[PDB]
Nucleic acid binder design. Structure first.
Lengths: 52, 129, 49, 174, 50, 79
RNA sequence: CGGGACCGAGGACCGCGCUCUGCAAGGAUGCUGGCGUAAUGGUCACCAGCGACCCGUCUUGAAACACGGACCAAGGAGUCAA
């Protein structure tokens, strides 16, 4: 009798998708990047970027 | 070339005789032969008027008529469809029988070591000098 | 994808919140809103949905 | 013509059997966004190398940020603009802190002084004047002068437009 | 539930894979050309007149 | 003239619809006519336009010409 | 996580579900105040803001031109037969 927005009503979200509660609890929208020291940009990329 | 009734032909009026052509609409059109003459041929053409097709008939000299290759691809595709289907039944492996539209290109890597890019300006400096 | 997209009804969106560009009926590269805008369609989807 | 960014756009012809490794072409495009940058890049290739967008591809799109945006710099711009007579060369100078700001000031300046639009202006070269003697235009020469100091006569005070009535006559001395 | 978990994991891995390929090409001194888009959303923004 | 003390009849800047339509039709017919004369233009036209070149007040024109020479000698050596 | 506006369609239960003694899950209920009458509401006249050429007919593609109309009551024009 009434279409309810699942993005506003959490119960419709849990009805249509049981994994939404697990997503919210485990915070899978806030996953940090993999650890490790990032290697620096090669020089030739920089001379190519700043070449007139 | 001796043309026959039912053959599908293309109309191309060769030469620069476009100064006094009565009907330039049928140049580059494709039609079906219904009448054959020693130096003439009868061609059925269809014209589109709004939502319906009207049927026209023209008499074209043989010098402006070439056989069309409209059904060549269809007959050819029927042939290799039959042959590869027989081959697939022989070897017991599935094979594609449907031609597909062009798909977008995938990811790939372009090397720079021997192909250093050239910087271009909106005009060439060799032309400036 | 064909069956899923044909099962989906065409989406009836509202007018964008914040509006269109000042001259709407030009190309996206010209300062309007027609044509291909690539990944910039997402802001228009947020505004119209 | 807007909040412009400078893009390094590299593109090429599509590889074929005859040419497995086509040449790469790089341009520096001042465009509001990457779509406009790629469109201008393909426009320039259609104008020069006869390479169409349908038969070519884009290898790279990168943003060229200014190295030192906090340093005051002088920029010389050599450009061509189209009018009813035809195409004309112009060399102009701008005192800015980034190439993109110099290009925006250029676009506003040409629109104000010659009514030329974005599509009628071709940017051929933008250079840094590394020395003071390389400055040619007097309106930049007066600004690069030694011990520059000036007052600001007749400064209208900033009053909020919603405050309709004032009780005292304002002063234009500060 | 399991299928949605798999889909979320696949989305995260494909994003990290595109980022990793771009970084590997940049580190090796080349440019990774991404695959062209397979999905387009189209919106009609002009009327039915003329 | 005595325009300050005794002005004459004002020149109206308010256009009329008939004049606007007539001027638009004249502009359209002039555009079509100049297109037709451009198609039937017998005047000779150069294949390559006359390029003005580099301005003299450009401070790096000399090193640009140096770049042009090293480019053309490199191209001649490659070819 | 706040602040605001408009709306409450249906009428025992059934279904999908969830945070599972219950529930924000197939559409509003609970508590309280004043009044119980012209108070709400409706009609008429007028003022105010905004909007708004006099109808019918003819013509052509259309307007314009032209024709009819002082007012009211009654009558008044695609019927019958083969």
């Amino acid at each position: 009798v009434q279409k309810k927005n699942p993005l506003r009503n959490k119960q419709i979200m849990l009805r249509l998708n049981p994994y939404a509660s697990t997503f919210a609890k485990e915070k899978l929208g806030e996953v940090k990047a993999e650890e490790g020291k990032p290697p620096k940009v090669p020089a030739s990329f920089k001379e190519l970027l700043h070449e007139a | 070339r001796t043309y026959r009734v039912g053959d599908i032909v293309d109309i191309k009026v060769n030469g620069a005789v476009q100064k006094g052509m009565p009907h330039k609409f049928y140049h580059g059109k494709t039609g079906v032969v219904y009448n054959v003459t020693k130096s003439a041929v009868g061609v059925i053409v269809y014209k589109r008027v709004k939502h319906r097709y009207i049927e026209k008939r023209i008499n074209v000299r043989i010098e402006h008529v070439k056989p069309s290759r409209s059904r060549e691809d269809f007959l050819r595709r029927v042939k290799e469809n039959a042959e590869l289907k027989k081959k697939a039944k022989a070897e017991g492996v599935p094979v594609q029988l449907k031609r597909q539209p062009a798909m977008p290109r995938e990811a790939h890597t372009v090397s720079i070591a021997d192909n250093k890019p050239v910087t271009l300006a909106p005009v060439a400096y060799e032309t400036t000098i | 994808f064909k069956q899923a997209a044909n099962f989906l009804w065409p989406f009836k969106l509202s007018n964008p919140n914040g509006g269109f560009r000042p001259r709407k009926f030009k190309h996206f590269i010209e300062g309007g809103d027609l044509g291909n805008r690539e990944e910039h369609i997402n802001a228009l989807i947020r505004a119209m949905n | 013509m807007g909040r412009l960014q400078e893009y390094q756009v590299i593109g090429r012809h599509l590889p074929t059997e005859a040419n497995p490794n086509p040449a790469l072409y790089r341009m520096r495009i001042f465009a509001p966004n990457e779509v406009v940058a790629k469109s201008r890049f393909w426009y320039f290739l259609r104008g020069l190398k006869k390479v169409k967008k349908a038969t070519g591809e884009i290898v790279s799109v990168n943003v060229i940020s200014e190295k030192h945006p906090l340093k005051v710099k002088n920029f010389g711009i050599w450009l061509r603009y189209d009018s009813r007579s035809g195409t004309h060369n112009m060399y102009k100078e701008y005192r800015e802190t980034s190439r993109v700001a110099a290009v925006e000031a250029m676009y506003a300046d040409m629109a104000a002084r010659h009514r030329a639009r974005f599509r009628s202006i071709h940017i051929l070269k933008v250079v840094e004047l590394e020395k003071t003697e390389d400055v040619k235009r007097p309106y930049i020469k007066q600004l690069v002068a030694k011990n520059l100091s000036f007052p600001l006569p007749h400064r209208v005070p900033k009053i909020s437009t919603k405050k309709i009535f004032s009780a005292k006559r304002p002063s234009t001395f500060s | 539930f399991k299928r949605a978990e798999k889909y979320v994991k696949e989305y995260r891995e494909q994003e990290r894979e595109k980022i990793r390929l771009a970084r590997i090409a940049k580190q090796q001194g080349s440019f990774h050309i991404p695959a062209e888009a397979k999905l387009v959303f189209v919106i009609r923004i002009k009327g039915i007149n003329k | 003239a005595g325009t300050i003390n005794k002005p004459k009849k004002p020149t109206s800047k308010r256009k009329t619809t008939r004049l606007r339509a007539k001027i638009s039709k004249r502009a359209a017919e002039k555009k079509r006519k100049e297109r037709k004369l451009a198609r039937k233009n017998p005047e000779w036209r150069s294949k390559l336009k006359k390029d003005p070149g580099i301005p003299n007040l450009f401070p790096y024109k000399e090193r640009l010409l140096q770049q042009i020479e090293e480019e053309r000698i490199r191209r001649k050596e490659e070819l």
